[PDB]
Design a protein around this ligand. Structure first.
Ligand SMILES: CCOP(=O)(O)OC[C@H]1O[C@@H](n2cnc3c(N)ncnc32)[C@H](O)[C@@H]1O
Ligand SMILES: CCOP(=O)(O)OC[C@H]1O[C@@H](n2cnc3c(N)ncnc32)[C@H](O)[C@@H]1O
Ligand SMILES: CCOP(=O)(O)OC[C@H]1O[C@@H](n2cnc3c(N)ncnc32)[C@H](O)[C@@H]1O
Lengths: 618, 618, 618
């Protein structure tokens, strides 16, 4: 077979007990209704997406046309003429119906220190935070930098920005001051929100000190709102720094929501690409929210009473779409988890799921492999309500898919392996929870409105039928597609739309097996996955070259048992240094300074570009 | 009886001739329809207030929900999702139907020098004044300071601010430069509107000189628009000062109205509270306007052809709600009266009512007592159309209520004693004109949507049934409730909502008599009424202490025959001064400087805190 | 007869072949339906204009009233309460229906160097140009100076301004730096759009150098966007100047349209008046667009498939209304012509019409007379589709009307002589294409909603009936009337509305003949037409006086064979100069400097005000 990974892989049905124990009526009746709805979404997207949008999203003003533009034109607009507000759809409309329903479960770094937050409380906090920004001069269309750990205040900040029509720009709280500066400068943000310190896995993160250093080079930032998470003494810049708790107490507990166009920008998410510095992937409002709600509902089988737990950081797209937007759009409860899967111990994920009766859990294989190595004795939890088990970021290997299905899910949960990207906004190739039969290691079948094609890598020609392999592209636009790269539409066109004209280029290889099931082969460009984080080899090379002793740098990606991919770094020293053992500590800190601890090199090879020869030798 | 003021007080029916001579059909059929509508407004406010609002107010976009939030939450919002504009509802919609109908009757300080202004003329003047502010950089959400006497230009200025979505902040034209400065700074206004001079009772008020001094300490004010009321030579600050007549002539006579949220702020009104400096009571848009229209209609029996005359200054809430918003909302004529009840003589109020055929008149008992002492020979006026006689600010005593009913109203008008506060936006306890039987000295029965309870002052417990006395609180929110204290929501919560959790605290004592009629006992806090003006004893104490010779100051309130309450001031001199007769003039001017002439002390006792011992001794 | 120009002038019917060859069904059935619709537009304009507007314009929010205000009040507003966007109506709604339909045919200065632009391409270019302005801080209500030749980018710039609600202020690309400065200062524009150079008739126009000089005195202009039309080396001001092609490549190909009030300003067009410096005639949005569409449809018989060619520059109102707004509103194709009727040769107009199959052509008699003198051998073109021949700016004389009807139109096209002004927005007295019988030299009959009256010049009294002569005024407002003179509503009132109270004063004399046909006599004030350009004699006098040797200047207007009117200039030298031959070159350049080449004097008479004696002597 051409797709060797599919050979003698049989599809597993959804387990019978999933339906027996399900608290509600499923959203689809079976694979027949998926196929019927899928074909309509491909053949008449105007009708299909108009209905999906009006089912799932409340518009202030109804839209006049589902979609205009084309892929090649790079001019796609969805639900044109509509007006709406994302915080209204995530908060107000649920507070209006059921103010005391729990919207957020905060699980703090220490067990036993969280709280639950109702939709009415969430409306209060979003409103008065929005008042703070408005009072300090933030206006519709301005960007706002967010540098926050996984606390509910992070949700408050995204949705407060949405409420006034500011464009939130979330920077992962593990980035260095250089990376924070770069993203804040490029977004031209004048307001930043952060914490005094972070606590994660019992370790203190000096967030405020990192922001202070970054802001020395961001002279357009005139206010910095600091949430007091630890109460530790931090440096304070009078006239610029403001205390979150002092400012929100000044302002009312309700604020009107700003009326936004369907195509006004909602957020920027800086993302590492094959070349160049990180790019600000821009999502607009209606189409992104329709994608988030539609996948939350049909992929994760989300019902209003559900308790949804995504393990990803708000600093990445998984956190954006599935910790925040999708569950709140659908009016269920979402879990904001501040700790690690290993603190206080390796049971922590399951401690959380059991205590809060989580119904769907969503994580990366990197965390599963780490926990699997830790040993099954850490998992002795009923978790009666857990019926969907999500996986994202890389393919979930056979032994991991089995361990996840059997030891975690008790053969009682549906494993949903979701393929997508920052640029797609939401799931694009994925089984639908409780509906689609699955194969270990396969992302299965396209989501509604996603028309995948397999392309010859060199000729760019379509390769028809089943049992084919090549480049993964989509033939048609879809509502939650990224709309531009901030400040650089030409880069957006060249990266995504001009490679294979008429198609959207994912950067990924893929096979489609005999049954039409998709198998993702990973990046055909210089993007690699390092312990759940999307990184550019070019980025790390630029960091290594920043050292005064390095002349030529080369970073390649090779498979690893635990991290998935193991980025390695070669360095050609300019002349010579007799302190090779010492130079290692200095190159390692250079990547720590340029990018962050999480991208620090495993080792720096000192030895005096055909990167493929390096990846094969390693 | 527990409510001793009610003992052997019989209810007086509406006089028969009120109905015989009424020009129209009344709004209610009787007390039965009041009771029916009142119970629905208490038991199903969502339905009741939705209908009332859609009856009385024209929305650009209909609202989606009548009310969200609670009293204890301090998050009340009314008619959420609606959009509207207050100047559209006060002007445009009446100009569109009947452009030549008279909206404003200006009665100037000199008799025979006013004019009448149609709804179309009012639309012109509001529009081009709004153009001036827009052209000078005023934007939606900015505050605008107004320091104007009772001339029609004051109405132009409030409604022009409303038209662009600026937040007008009216400062009584009798305040000192210190008080004007304080209110302008706290509101952070960048634009101010005033007159060259005021004329009232034949006396010149140097408004421009007072603004000039205040603006020396308001460096954010970049334009000051001066209406030429007297033409007197006033100081002029080139580059900042602008002539109203020169600027409006530049701009068109129509301007679009800005689309406002139901809960966008409409105005701030600085108000003296029990503690601290005056606070900016903030009203938003839809709920305030619904309250204003609903009381104008049902309390004052306002019909479109009516000529409505409120005697209160636009600088206070009575002027805001009943000189400006309520009558114009309902499309009748309102009288803007520039003089005093004593100039040229004590007949002046009745001269005005007779000449303009006023149908409803609304005044404070302080003015009635002053006129009553002047003698009945000043009142020899037919006033055929006068059918409603309103009283506000303190309880209308027995002898005054009789004199008002018999000598002024010819036993032909309904005396409507309206209890309310700046914070309630509009009447909350009041008879309804032509409907409710009244008792002298009683405010009678709650308005629609007002659920009064009597609370034990110390235990805060509800006291059920009739013939009870205690603290006056409301059990439920109502549309025109103040939404915050500007810049200090915590003070709003602590003052109004955290004293008796679940209730709104009025600051007033009250009895509910055997028939369920309410009798207002006055402020249980340190707020007193001085000749129609709400004042804080703390404020006057802070003024007296501003003198370099005063160490400890104490101001208390005791009843007075004419002013109602007689605030008195004790002073403990720091060491000693042998110029006691001279120090009196210097302390008196200090209060004149800090607050204004109207709050100047009756006498300052020089003699070296248990304020109750002082109030009892006096 | 009183109207001597009408004596023995018979009406010519529309030629029969017009109907035989017409590609579609006409908009009116005949003169009977015109009369029926005309009487309704005069007798019930509220009903008539409500239907016309809703036929022709797509509103975001429907309007609540057709018209408020009066002529004498100077407060006219049309379609109040409506919301819409002009670029949506010129672009989006046609791109949504038929993205590949050709919107613009660009005919470049060199034949064979144009291109065709579809509605979808136009939506792209308008959107990303709007992004540039938004990114550089342009906001709704700001004015934007445009100094562009006849290239499609000029349409992009008007409609991008409309898209964000900026107010475009187009300056004819032949104006001098002084005139550009004056218009940019008075409009207080902070952004300007121009070209590096213009090419017209094979001659280079140094647009950038002219802007650079003007901007030295416009210190509020902080960005200048330069389109690279020639690629010639031009001076560059780093930090202010931006390249159009570099900036648009950064931004998305779609941008939401800003929601505008019916009465928000759409544009300013500076216009020479009888007295004073040029005035910024301001048009608002809904009424102007309704007038443009209604005349495009009913006067020019525009159908969606038509190819419409107006010969006027975008720098004047004919270009505004009929190169840009009317054809694009109606969704047909418009021709943007960059050259002159004489380059490369005198066939050029017909070369263009034949190659692009133009259906309607619209030009000034000044161009016709110039071509007629050139000789009929330059016209040997089929032009099968040419069915409407438009004339504007002055009366089309008998011999020219015949030459236009016979040699150009092959007796196959309807000659439509359209009378109107910058201030009327669109045609007001005109035959309707294919409907109205015409007389050579007459503008025939009023357009819908135009109620012309003939007034006695001195007594200002109406002169009833037919065969009368006098001043031309309109009795009623109409939707596309100019709404103010920018910054000077008083001048607007005094110029147009206070001369003859209750009427609109056109500045023109006119006769109404025995059949009720109108004959325009031209300006009764000091405005003259110089080779298709509206000019003030006062303006040229002020220019001549700017010379240090001129004391008193006098400019008068007399008829001319080719230019129509021949403005001449007399000068009284201050003392004396023995270089009279040299002084001529210096006075001629002074007018070239103050106004522009196109207003330079024919000759300056040096000889040491009763202007009528000068006009008669010449
Ligand atoms: C959501 C995170 O989006 P990003 O951080 O922008 O990374 C997106 C990139 O990760 C990879 N990827 C994501 N999901 C899967 C999956 N289920 N199976 C295999 N590979 C996957 C892929 O190479 C894609 O192109
Ligand atoms: C409208 C002015 O509002 P303010 O200037 O904010 O004062 C409001 C405060 O005046 C008092 N008050 C007002 N009306 C009455 C009344 N009819 N009978 C008795 N007392 C009254 C009361 O103590 C309240 O709390
Ligand atoms: C559209 C250009 O408008 P403007 O450049 O503002 O000039 C408008 C002024 O030109 C004159 N005019 C325009 N059309 C005609 C016509 N068909 N017959 C005679 N005279 C005409 C007239 O004197 C008017 O008052």
């Amino acid at each position: 077979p051409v797709v060797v990974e599919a050979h003698q892989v049989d599809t597993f049905d959804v387990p019978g007990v999933f339906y027996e124990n399900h608290p509600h009526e499923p959203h689809l009746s079976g694979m027949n209704e998926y196929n019927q709805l899928y074909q309509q979404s491909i053949n008449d997207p105007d009708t299909f997406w108009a209905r999906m949008a009006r089912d799932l999203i409340t518009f202030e003003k109804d839209f006049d046309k589902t979609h205009i533009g084309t892929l090649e034109g790079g001019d796609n607009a969805w639900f044109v003429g509509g007006r709406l507000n994302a915080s209204f759809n995530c908060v107000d409309r649920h507070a209006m119906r059921d103010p005391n329903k729990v919207a957020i479960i905060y699980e703090a770094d220490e067990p036993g220190h969280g709280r639950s937050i109702t939709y009415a409380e969430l409306l209060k906090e979003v409103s008065r935070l929005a008042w703070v920004m408005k009072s300090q001069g933030v206006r519709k269309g301005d960007t706002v930098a967010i540098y926050l750990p996984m606390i509910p205040e992070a949700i408050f900040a995204l949705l407060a920005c949405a409420r006034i029509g500011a464009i939130h720009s979330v920077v992962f709280a593990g980035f260095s001051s250089d990376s924070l500066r770069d993203r804040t400068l490029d977004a031209r943000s004048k307001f930043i929100i952060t914490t005094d310190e972070g606590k994660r896995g019992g370790k203190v993160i000096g967030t405020k000190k990192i922001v202070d250093e970054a802001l020395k080079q961001c002279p357009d930032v005139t206010n910095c709102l600091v949430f007091k998470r630890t109460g530790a003494d931090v440096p304070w810049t009078k006239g610029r720094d403001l205390w979150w708790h002092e400012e929100v107490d000044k302002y009312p507990n309700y604020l009107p929501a700003e009326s936004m166009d369907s195509e006004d920008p909602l957020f920027l998410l800086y993302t590492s690409g094959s070349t160049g510095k990180p790019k600000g992937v821009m999502h607009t409002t209606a189409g992104y929210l329709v994608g988030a709600a539609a996948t939350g509902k049909y992929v994760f089988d989300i019902h209003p009473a559900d308790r949804f737990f995504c393990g990803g950081d708000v600093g990445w797209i998984t956190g954006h779409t599935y910790v925040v937007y999708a569950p709140l759009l659908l009016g269920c409860t979402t879990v904001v988890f501040e700790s690690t899967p290993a603190y206080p111990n390796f049971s922590r994920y399951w401690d959380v799921i059991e205590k809060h009766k989580v119904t769907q859990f969503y994580v990366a294989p990197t965390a599963l492999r780490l926990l699997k190595r830790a040993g099954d004795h850490h998992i002795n939890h009923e978790m009666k309500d857990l019926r969907i088990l999500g996986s994202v970021g890389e393919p979930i290997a056979a032994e991991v898919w089995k361990w996840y299905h059997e030891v975690v899910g008790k053969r009682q949960a549906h494993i949903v392996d979701t393929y997508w990207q920052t640029e797609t906004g939401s799931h694009v190739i994925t089984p639908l929870g409780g509906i689609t039969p699955t194969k270990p290691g396969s992302a299965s079948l396209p989501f509604f409105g996603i028309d995948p094609v397999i392309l010859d890598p060199v000729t760019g020609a379509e390769i028809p039928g089943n049992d084919v392999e090549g480049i993964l592209a989509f033939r048609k636009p879809w509502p939650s597609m990224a709309r531009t790269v901030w400040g650089d539409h030409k880069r957006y066109m060249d990266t995504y739309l001009n490679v294979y004209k008429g198609f959207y280029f994912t950067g990924d290889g893929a096979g489609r097996d005999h049954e039409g099931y998709y198998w993702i082969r990973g990046r055909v460009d210089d993007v690699v996955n390092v312990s759940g984080h999307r990184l550019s080899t070019a980025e790390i090379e630029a960091a290594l070259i920043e050292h005064h002793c390095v002349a030529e740098a080369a970073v390649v990606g090779v498979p690893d048992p635990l991290t998935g991919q193991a980025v390695h770094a070669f360095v050609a020293l300019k002349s010579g240094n007799d302190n090779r053992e010492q130079l290692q500590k200095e190159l390692i800190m250079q990547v720590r300074k340029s990018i962050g601890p999480f991208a620090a090199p495993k080792v720096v090879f000192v030895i005096d570009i055909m990167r493929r020869i390096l990846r094969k030798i390693l």
